[PDB]
Design a protein around this ligand. Structure first.
Ligand SMILES: [Cl-]
Ligand SMILES: [Cl-]
Ligand SMILES: [Cl-]
Ligand SMILES: [Cl-]
Ligand SMILES: [Cl-]
Ligand SMILES: [Cl-]
Ligand SMILES: [Cl-]
Ligand SMILES: [Cl-]
Ligand SMILES: [Cl-]
Ligand SMILES: [Cl-]
Ligand SMILES: [Cl-]
Ligand SMILES: [Cl-]
Ligand SMILES: [Mg+2]
Ligand SMILES: [Mg+2]
Lengths: 503, 499, 504, 505
């Protein structure tokens, strides 16, 4: 039969991960440059490496040191396939060791001097014949392998960049995948395009074509069920499936009582009314509040909420007839992290999995949704935890507390959006603390906490630099408009040592 | 492809500064839209075939003699009409109502009847947090109308006649300050007016590529390439539509940022495979600017020499029928002479692939085509470049210093994530000196602003330690700089650029 | 030394929130002053023998009947009189003028005649940058008056009758918002009223030491010593005046900051050589507070136990005639509003006579006195500390476990504020213990500390402090990293109004 | 003859300076504790040390290392006088070296208290600990015999020591800095408990001492004082007025480089309010003429200093029979770290009166407060000798000074109004002779660009640009642009010291 044209993944880069926290950034930067990419652990089998058919290979950094026994090595086939190879920091060091060089034992900015312009450096520079890079100060290449030439250096790091342009092996002692390296994108672009010969077909407009066709091929005339939350990933999945298979899609939305003000109404408005998708709404507030009654331990709260949600979803799924497929919003980071019953549903339900985002990074999901016409407010919304307000009401969850928190959180959101600071944070939300303070008669009422952070990875996060007068306007509004709130505090704890959510 | 503009909304402009926001929010909801002045002829309104009409706000009063009125055909086509503030006031007056003469501010309106416009929407229960227009108010609603929302000060905050499908609000749903404003307008264009959702970046690309191939055929097109968002998206669209028929001319006027010319060539010629001719004209611009201190004279000189350099490059090409420009829909709305301002011997026909798009639609288009974030979300760069960021006489010595200090500024803003948290940022060279440790050297100024429209702007809320990091880097890495200052002047009464 | 109060200015209060600022500005200009309600009896005013009278502003309108007026004796003593806002309006009415009916704002007034009040003063040339009270204006100036300053919007901004020496301004010279306000009031008390400048810290010390020796003689005096500014300055003054006749009792109620008791003993007993009896009462207060969650009940318990501990210590002393207290002039001062409404609160067996060496002094004068006597900056500029101490900074039940944690976190906060220079850039700063927990990182599940810091001049309105971002981050990181039982730090971002400064 | 009673300086501490930038802070904390102190270089002669009669000696820190060649040593008599000695960092290290110990070659630390001597006493931050500002580097590897280690860290086993028989004390951290939480209390235990000193060095007693000393020096003779209105000359004026009354004459010179109405304000306070004889010399035209065409900042400073002395000398020559010139010299000016009177022409031969020359800056302020001088006078930021002459970049012109005076005044008004004046150590406007565009409604402005400068600092050796609130700075720039037609734009100096200076020229 006719099958989906997959031309836009023919050009591809393989990233072998040696342990660096930046390894996924390499893969993401290749995709931003218009080239398909996948990442695997360094000990990827030779069979899989050949079967992948890479146009080029990038060896990431890692927290290891080659001169220690049992240190990671690249598979030898990497240097024998006849395709270019780029080694980043440790990747450069293990490339040197395995090709006749030597590595001698030993993070910050450095200005490397361009001593030879190969095809990786090309015409690039910051200051003249220099590159402002993010350097890993540690191990260094003591002797470059046969056929290599030093292309860049610093006084303290004489081997900052090298290349054997006959075998097309390249290496840098700095990280081009991070923003701290000013020409990092441009360097990686030179590697995948000029050096590896890859085109630029991996773009949102082409990915939509590919994925709609692949979905049609997988699903055919069959029905697909989607758990719809209104988060970015499930929203784009719903839009993709609606475009692909139309009314063969059915969505189930569960209101667990732990959502923000009018969130359920908003999900129905956008997906059922605006977009014309079939959406079943399960209103389960009382069930969740009952399951949570008297539960103060946060881990127990998270367990209960996850369990009741699965039960409610399974109940709704059982009312449907002849649904072969369960769609989920799995993204490529989920799949990378797993290799480092379907849907977790009870066994009476037997779905096959549909995962249209499973090969996409988070920014690609957003670009896809924008291309499909999904509005800014939906695509750029901050993440919302699975347990919802269940982990933003400290200790016991009560309906009275959730209702107050919804009002206070909505004021916070309104002011962030009106002022333009919503998109200038990565996460923001109110927290209900079940303690009271005095305010002016003289009344005595709950203390609300505001949480807002700046981050790119959510692995480190700083409390947000919100303007003084914005914060003051928000706290004044919360206290003036909610009789049950005496006082507002702001979380001034960064990650680490604090977490982003309080529970 | 042309099916994607068949559903369409007409916005009649009564003078509000928010009128274009109405048209933009319709497009964001997935429906094509156009905006015209209120006095649109009945012939043109009928020809537009609107699925619905929105009457904007405005700074006029219905009771004043000669005040604007909607042409009565608006209420006779049998399509829904939404009046916003003045649009509702003139709607009431022209349908047998009364308006009582009377500031902007927030208001909590009470929902009293849930019609098709309000629907199920609310903020607090049965309320809406809105950006209210005080002053003139409807005192008697026309026959067939029902009050749908109110405030104590404003008993007629919203109304509808759902038989004739006439809707009205006394607040502004088109601004962010009305919490459910997007949703109210969505109910109007989709639920009330029956419009679908085909006006999306993926479909707009297909339509515009088709239209470009129809206009251009196999003929050649010339494009002035700057690197700004508009010219970048035009270049990508044209490259897709007509391939090798496109020729770009990029002019390095000596007033660009560090390595800017190399980066333009790297991206458009090398990465994207577009034919780009680079005119290196630094000496020409510096020679023309030498000894010229008046900023208006500098701007005139730079604009004149740019056109001359562009004309000289264009004359070298053979058989080019078309000149492409990055005109956007706000440019056409504002407009309502040789092509390109070029000499008479150059007679091009105009190609304008973005002329029906707003700024954010242009960016969504570029993103859909795979253009990188750094290109699409770049801050604007003025025509005269560094020529208006070097106070008084422009000398190569000053431009070279400024390029280094500006580059440090940009590096720190991008690295810290604050580049995208400002609307505009750049360094300025002041030809004055101060002492440092002994050093006597130039004083650099940093400019950064927050704004959504560039009409009013506040100086940016950059974190103290980021600014300290930037000034310390500049002073430590550039021997010729003694000190860094930060522009703490908002617009108005300061302009964004210094010259 | 009593000469230093012979020159004196009387301020009649018509209800303005700035009325006390007038009296304070007079004292800063070196002239003794007192403040009373507008309805001060004529016999009292004559007995006061003022060298000049200032009629303050007020929240009333002269056109509405039932509104306050000044006693005519004010305009009949032959001493200069200055009317501020409402004081100018009622002066105009009662002297043959008219006031028409008409909020606060800045204004540049034009000087049209340079009398003794305006003098050679100006901001921009022949102008004054002032803080105006709009609303009611003077339409007809009284006879004998010349208009001395004006605005387009307010043609009568300042007046004077230099033969009768009656002066009036439509703006408030007593507030910082008026750029030349100090200098105008200086021209009034010195040039116009002839007052000298003897009311200064060095002379006040000599007068007060002399008066204390006259009141106390060779008798014994007991002082409750808290470590706050007022009690510290009382202790220093009494030590100077009566030496070994002074006995201090300091009570550690278990609700003080880290090492606070040791610091009181170090400074007052060790350094200054004063007799200080230390009552270590932590267990007693914690036992009385255990299981008590209501904040009003906590305050009542703490106040009751403190008096009981103090009384038990007072009973151990032999033949003590006087109890000294840190009462200051704001505690006693007569307002237009305050007029509209056993010693030490001790048991009956304890009958002391009251000594109040600061009762005629404003807060800043108390600090200047302490500085003059050599008390260190850290003692004189300490933020206030509430009577109930940490009792109202631990939400709900007070436990030793919570107080110990709070002391550690508060001490870190104070260290960084004093180190960085921001302690003196706030009016009040402290940590609060919230008995709620949050997750941290192995996983931590521990208490959430709140930090409170405000900026204010009067404590009637206060904004949360503009602490630098990186300082707050340094404080929160230290607290979380150094106290195992704290997971997270929050910052109170609530201003007054509508929030209070203390949480309980 | 009866001479001034100097009992309040009998108790005294000698500080020997080995080169630390914090050495003066030691001397200042002793005075804050109520004890007179003086500081001299480490190589103070035995004769002078004995003549000083110290009740205690503190050996300061230093950048040197005991084992470098030519490294400083304390005069051995320091350990032979029978008075207590405290060594701070290098002072501890050289104390150990010279008493038989061994020395083996900046950040916070929590030192563990292991033995409570009379220096540590009952002090602690966290229980049995001290939060201190440590000097990582040279460590005492072997304490002299008779010493006990009193405090330690894991990385610095010898953080504090004492031999309480000889009363020698030592710390590896700096108690004189604000970074050491209990630093004041530690120094207080040393000067009071350990050295037995009282607390008579207080503002009220200093006033009595200095007034009597001034009367003894001056008698019935006349005194001339150059009066600028700065804090030091203001306190000198107030002290001399109290001491000698109408024997004092002041001369104030308006050099045309002062702030708005500054001359009027000097006359208003000293001549009118305080009743002091003040001669006013209005010399603006003279200074502007001398500065015409001068762009080099060092030439401007030289010209302004020279012309000021000439103007002052002319006023001084009009006075008959004046024996004394008073100056506002303070102890930092004199102090010993590791020419005609007043710099006047030779025809003027004054004897010097210097009532503040043994006082630190904070003590000068306390004296002024004691005398009743207003807060605004006592806590005023410093103002440079050359005035606005170094705040107008390049050539000084009357047009620029007049504009700058208006801009600076707006800045000061808002700082004082908001309470942020006292929350900075220095603040001023700068006139840059460059222009930029503004929008004034439908009209275009093209006018000068004003810079604002404000810093936070304690020592003026390092200074950070001030953390002024966003909305306050916006209020200031809006006011300046809206009230001064000749200003298009306001910028804020965001350069800290180092690598920038506080003043621009
Ligand atoms: Cl809800
Ligand atoms: Cl962010
Ligand atoms: Cl987290
Ligand atoms: Cl360049
Ligand atoms: Cl912005
Ligand atoms: Cl502008
Ligand atoms: Cl304690
Ligand atoms: Cl404050
Ligand atoms: Cl309060
Ligand atoms: Cl002046
Ligand atoms: Cl400061
Ligand atoms: Cl400096
Ligand atoms: Mg509900
Ligand atoms: Mg204890």
């Amino acid at each position: 039969h006719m099958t989906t044209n997959t031309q836009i993944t023919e050009d591809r880069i393989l990233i072998l991960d040696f342990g660096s926290q930046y390894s996924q950034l390499i893969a993401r930067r290749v995709r931003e440059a218009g080239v398909y990419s996948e990442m695997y652990a360094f000990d990827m089998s030779e069979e899989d490496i050949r079967a992948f058919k890479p146009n080029g290979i990038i060896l990431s950094g890692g927290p290891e040191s080659v001169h220690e026994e049992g240190s990671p090595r690249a598979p030898q086939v990497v240097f024998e396939l006849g395709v270019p190879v780029l080694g980043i920091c440790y990747g450069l060091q293990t490339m040197s060791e395995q090709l006749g060089g030597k590595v001698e034992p030993g993070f910050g900015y450095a200005e490397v001097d361009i001593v030879k312009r190969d095809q990786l450096i090309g015409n690039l520079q910051d200051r003249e014949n220099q590159l402002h890079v993010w350097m890993s100060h540690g191990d260094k290449v003591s002797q470059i392998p046969e056929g290599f030439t030093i292309t860049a250096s610093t006084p303290s790091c004489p081997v900052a960049a090298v290349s054997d342009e006959t075998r097309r092996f390249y290496g840098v002692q700095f990280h081009p995948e991070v923003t701290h390296t000013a020409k990092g994108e441009e360097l990686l672009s030179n590697f995948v395009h000029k050096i590896c010969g890859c085109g630029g077909l991996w773009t949102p407009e082409h990915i939509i074509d590919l994925r709609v066709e692949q979905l049609r091929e997988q699903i055919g005339n069959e029905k697909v069920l989607l758990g719809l939350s209104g988060g970015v990933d499930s929203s784009v999945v719903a839009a993709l499936l609606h475009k692909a298979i139309g009314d063969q899609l059915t969505c189930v939305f569960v209101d667990n009582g732990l959502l923000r003000l009018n969130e359920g109404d908003q999900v129905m408005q956008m997906f059922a009314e605006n977009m014309g998708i079939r959406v079943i709404r399960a209103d389960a507030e009382a069930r969740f509040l009952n399951a949570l009654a008297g539960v103060t331990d946060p881990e127990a709260k998270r367990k209960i909420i996850g369990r009741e949600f699965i039960e409610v979803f399974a109940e709704e799924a059982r009312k449907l007839d002849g649904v072969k497929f369960l769609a989920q919003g799995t993204i490529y980071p989920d799949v990378i992290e797993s290799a480092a019953n379907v849907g977790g549903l009870p066994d009476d339900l037997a779905f096959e999995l549909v995962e249209p985002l499973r090969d996409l990074f988070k920014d690609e999901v957003r670009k896809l949704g924008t291309t499909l016409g999904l509005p800014h407010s939906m695509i750029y919304r901050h993440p919302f935890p699975g347990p919802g307000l269940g982990v933003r009401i400290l200790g016991e969850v009560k309906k009275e507390y959730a209702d107050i928190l919804r009002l206070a959180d909505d004021i916070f959101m309104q002011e962030l959006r009106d002022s333009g600071w919503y998109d200038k944070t990565a996460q923001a939300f109110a927290v209900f603390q079940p303690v009271k303070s005095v305010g002016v008669g003289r009344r005595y009422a709950w203390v609300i906490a505001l949480r807002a952070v700046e981050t790119v990875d959510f692995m480190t996060a700083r409390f947000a630099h919100l303007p003084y007068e914005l914060v003051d306007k928000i706290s004044t509004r919360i206290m003036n408009e909610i009789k049950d709130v005496s006082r507002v505090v702001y979380d001034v704890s960064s990650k680490p040592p604090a977490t982003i959510e309080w529970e």
